[PDB]
Design a protein around this ligand. Structure first.
Ligand SMILES: C[C@H](c1ccnc(Nc2nc3cc(-c4cnn(CC5CC5)c4)ccc3[nH]2)c1)N1CCN(C(=O)CC(F)(F)F)CC1
Ligand SMILES: C[C@H](c1ccnc(Nc2nc3cc(-c4cnn(CC5CC5)c4)ccc3[nH]2)c1)N1CCN(C(=O)CC(F)(F)F)CC1
Lengths: 629, 629
């Protein structure tokens, strides 16, 4: 609060330090005459190599470089006393992407919505910089900034471009840049992996330590089309995977599109790997797609259908098939309480409106095993009695990061449970429709038919071999009523199963699982906030490096409470949320097997009324259709 | 950070001061051996009147007084050096009710959900204190504390009871306690009014100033059953109202129950006013009721039906009538895409599940004017160039408090708009059901009838006055088909109106109003946060009382920006949100008048098929039913 420098138009305190980096420091400053905030880049240690003409010249390139995803540099001024050239750039009050991924909530990846904002803005800004000539080659979470836009959605903005000429990140380097129009895209892929996963792609046991010799051959291994390599044992083996982890909170839909992107931008051989034209073309296709939410009611899973607005419904059903393994012919739909039917020519933009809360359910005639929600079972890390400032800040992010996953799963399981409740509720009312639709198609036959047998008796009453022909029509016309008598009665068996108290009651949906009234996701978040506030204090205590005795005891009580919250919340997640979800899931399995049976019985009954409907119209035309002069 | 006292087991810093009050100060403290937080009440200025036996004795009453809504007093200790008896009480980390109502969001009352938490806990705690003998007589927002419970919902907890024996709030006093089992309930009513409204019940122009002489006759006026009295002009007149204001963000449903409570606990005459037995009985009835959400689609209004879980559906329809003015016979229902039908005996607990997002729509045969949403049109207060610390903190709460209302209305209008969209979408599909239901009831007649005229021609073909009787049955049997030909064709007029592109298209719902994609409520909240952060800084600057030159200029730039945000958000509210809501509302008026017409035409057509359905079964029984030996 006492010391800090100033220039002709701007000023800044020295405690107000945002950034750090060998060429320069970045400070939160304010324009004098207006009081408006800017980021202020001061160049310490600059005195050996400052060329007036060149350095000033290239800044005028960036001066007028306007774009949504580029951190604007407003003016280049000189400092009053030290005669240091200072840069006046946009103050992005939210920090950087790294700042984001440090929040425990993002320990296992960003939210799907937020991840696409990153992809859109990172790819969009960079494409703009290449168009104007500039290159970056160093896209890192920490040099991608963030502002909350006017609509409340984030807007990411890149900086730190074009400084490699004058004079990047060790965790984001290429198989030949360890010890070039494509080399930029490796660091990109590493970033896009990190944002989706929550952790980096390639990692040894000790990490990027003095024992970072492992990392080079991990990076240069380039196996198959793999995207990650992780050795979980000291001096151990490097497990490869060309797929995202289970902890990844990203839709299956998107993963199937993102995996090829990252796989083909994370390679060594130059002629094999993609180029910014290929890459910018492929990422566009992702971001130009709309998302249709399809809940596969039969298998208790939720999906995101990443379809193009111009794509035909014939493609949509193929897409769904790739995720639900249901055939386009068998795929049935329900929407807002009513069977939905989809002509193949229809475009995706003219589908109904969907959300996770209210999606398009998918039913089938054929049976399907019910997988349920498929999540990663992560146990709590270790809370040690050691007093360590840096390893308690490290632990606090982890342990809380797990509870965020446990509180994430807890809510999705409830969405599933309540979506199943909803989808099942309509289905029974929609199967009840078919039993009541058949009754009217039955009277269409039984009344006409049992009036026709009276008419054949009315024919012999008014006006021999031909009398023997009449009784033959009469008996076989009463033989229709014999199978008609059975069909009417075995239909009333479905009446019982469907009607309240019967065999297909949804009574269980309401009294087996967990509910929004249970407030179990709200319950957890309470403890989550306790844990997260401790994490940020432990983050701050990391910065202080030394601590008073009174504070020391505090951070020793609070760390002990950070475990009690964690285990308190964890017992509640498994012994209440999970268990009662499993109980609801298992009970759901039986209703689906039981309901599918009804849906093949009720059909036969109907596909039979259609047949004795044919045989009455055909034979109310036998003697009624004879001739004479 | 330098000075603060301690006792045998607890300790506290002196800067860590939570409360203030002539007998004692309250500080945030911590138990030494555990590090656990408590509220610590230290008694300064106590030396004239401390009686050892009595004072210590009565604390042992409160020592073991356990209840959910009572701030527990754990131990009574003595301070090490000054020998001052110190109280160790529960630390309620959320502050008090007053703290809550100071947030600009609550400038025009608490949220409905939150208000009931207050009612429940205030009435529940107090009833418990009366049962054990203790009285309060001083229930004020500031001496009602708040904690976030384990389920995340608030839990309010009262303190400051039983100190009037040893030795309350001027804004919460009774017509005889200005210059007693019921007198407590006035301060209650004042509180419950304040929580619902956002402002106090009775107020002069200058307020509780040196010119507080007005306030006594306002309070003692006790007109009719009024609940508020406000003079808006200096030396002016006191406007009375026995009803809540429009700015009140509480359901009409609840207001109709709360107004009698407050009206009968805000009086002077003792024999006229309620008692805690009457009062605790009446408030229970409110809190034991469940809320059914009914959206009166026809009049574009949303309602909360405060019904008892044991009440019959015959009562429910009467309740709705009190709010929608729709008759129980005419009231029609729709739920999750399907007509809902309600037997009178059914209990409220066995109704379907409702939310504001997904409620029970109400349609009618009779017409109704469409009121729309009915809100208070509040203009921004005045931003003066005066530099005033206390009047800029005052202004900042106000101006931001209006924008919270404007951002509140903005969201409700969207709920309405999207609920109308949804309710209309089902209704057209549910009227389409009736046109397609009639066709099958039409074939039931036209096929049988146009097969019967062939049979009367088939009768004269096989086997005079009786021939002249046949042709008379024949012509009048073809006279049924004459009105049948018109009915089939004028039905296809409804086919066009209903079918896409027709006269009853919902095409407009999708392209006239505002949408969740417009992100207009998100847009506002962005500016709202800018304004609110300034408000809290201006609240903090109020406490400092003097300011540095650099800070002075800051608070002069930031105040100027607090207006620009406010007017920026306001233009967007009216010129975008309101206007496009009005446009959607006006267009809705026409579709309802147009759709109601169809619903009386399609019925007649059907109430006519029922009639030529009667006349065919009756006359396929004339000559078909003759006799002879
Ligand atoms: C958490 C958020 C934050 C954190 C980190 N960065 C930013 N915001 C930001 N960081 C920027 C960096 C650049 C930038 C441009 N080039 N480079 C290169 C060099 C890094 C190597 C960096 C440009 C704009 C930038 N905006 C904001 N803060 C901002 C307000 N808070 C302060 O002010 C702290 C004080 F009081 F202590 F100051 C505390 C809360
Ligand atoms: C905003 C919230 C707050 C504000 C006001 N009160 C409480 N909490 C609280 N207030 C209480 C009062 C009583 C109480 C009991 N009797 N009486 C009678 C006397 C009032 C006349 C009062 C009991 C428990 C109480 N809990 C919490 N704070 C708490 C943590 N923060 C500090 O600590 C500030 C520091 F660092 F500066 F300290 C800053 C954030």
């Amino acid at each position: 609060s006492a010391m800090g420098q100033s220039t002709s138009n701007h000023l800044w305190l020295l405690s107000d330090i945002l950034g750090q980096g060998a060429t320069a420091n970045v400070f939160r400053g304010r324009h004098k005459k207006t009081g408006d905030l800017f980021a202020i880049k001061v160049f310490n240690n600059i005195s050996f190599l400052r060329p007036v003409d060149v350095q000033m010249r290239e800044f005028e390139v960036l001066k007028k470089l306007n774009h949504k995803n580029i951190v604007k540099l407003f003016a280049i001024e000189e400092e009053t006393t030290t005669r240091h050239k200072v840069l006046i750039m946009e103050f992005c009050p939210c920090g950087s992407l790294y700042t984001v991924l440090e929040e425990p909530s993002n320990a296992y990846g960003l939210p799907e919505s937020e991840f696409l904002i990153v992809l859109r803005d990172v790819v969009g800004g960079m494409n703009h910089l290449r168009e104007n000539g500039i290159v970056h080659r160093d896209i890192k979470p920490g040099n991608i900034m963030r502002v909350i836009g006017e609509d409340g959605q984030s807007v990411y903005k890149l900086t730190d471009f074009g400084a490699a000429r004058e004079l990047g990140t060790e965790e984001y380097l290429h198989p030949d840049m360890y010890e070039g129009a494509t080399v930029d895209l490796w660091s990109i892929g590493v970033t896009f992996y990190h944002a989706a996963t929550g952790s980096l792609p390639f990692r040894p046991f000790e990490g990027p330590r003095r024992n970072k010799e492992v990392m080079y051959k991990i990076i240069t291994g380039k196996p198959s089309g793999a995207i990650s390599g992780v050795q979980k044992a000291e001096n151990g083996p490097i497990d490869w995977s060309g797929d995202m982890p289970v902890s990844c909170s990203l839709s299956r839909g998107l993963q199937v599109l993102l995996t090829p992107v990252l796989a083909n931008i994370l390679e060594a051989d130059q002629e094999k790997c993609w180029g910014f034209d290929q890459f910018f073309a492929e990422t566009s296709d992702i971001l130009h797609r709309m998302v249709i939410h399809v809940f596969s009611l039969q298998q208790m899973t939720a999906h995101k259908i990443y379809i193009h607005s111009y794509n035909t419904a014939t493609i949509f059903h193929e897409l769904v098939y790739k995720q639900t393994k249901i055939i386009s012919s068998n795929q049935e739909l329900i929407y807002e309480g009513r069977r939905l039917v989809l002509e193949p020519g229809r475009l995706a933009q003219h589908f109904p409106k969907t959300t996770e809360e209210n999606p398009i359910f998918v039913v089938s005639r054929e049976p399907l095993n019910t997988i349920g929600l498929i999540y990663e079972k992560i146990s709590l890390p270790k809370v040690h009695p050691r007093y360590d400032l840096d390893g308690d800040a490290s632990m606090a992010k982890a342990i809380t990061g797990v509870v965020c996953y446990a509180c994430r799963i807890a809510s999705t399981l409830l969405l599933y449970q309540e979506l199943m409740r909803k989808g099942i509720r309509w289905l029974i009312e929609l199967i009840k429709d078919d039993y009541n639709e058949t009754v009217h198609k039955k009277t269409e036959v039984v009344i006409t038919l049992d009036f026709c047998i009276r008419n054949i008796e009315k024919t012999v009453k008014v006006y021999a071999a031909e009398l023997g022909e009449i009784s033959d029509i009469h008996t076989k016309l009463l033989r229709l009523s014999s199978s008609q008598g059975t069909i009417e009665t075995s239909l009333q068996d479905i009446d019982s199963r469907l009607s309240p108290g019967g065999s297909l009651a949804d009574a269980w949906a309401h009294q087996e699982g967990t509910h929004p009234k249970d407030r179990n996701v709200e319950k957890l978040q309470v403890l989550l906030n306790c844990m997260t506030e401790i994490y940020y204090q432990f983050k701050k205590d990391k910065a202080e490096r030394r601590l008073a005795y009174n504070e020391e005891q505090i951070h020793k009580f609070d760390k002990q409470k950070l475990y009690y919250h964690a285990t308190k919340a964890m017992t509640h997640f498994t012994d209440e949320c999970v268990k009662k979800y499993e109980a609801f899931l298992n009970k759901s399995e039986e209703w689906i097997r039981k309901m599918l049976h009804l849906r093949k019985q009720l059909l036969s009954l109907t596909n039979q009324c259609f047949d004795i409907e044919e045989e009455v119209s055909k034979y109310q035309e036998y003697t009624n259709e004879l001739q004479e002069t």
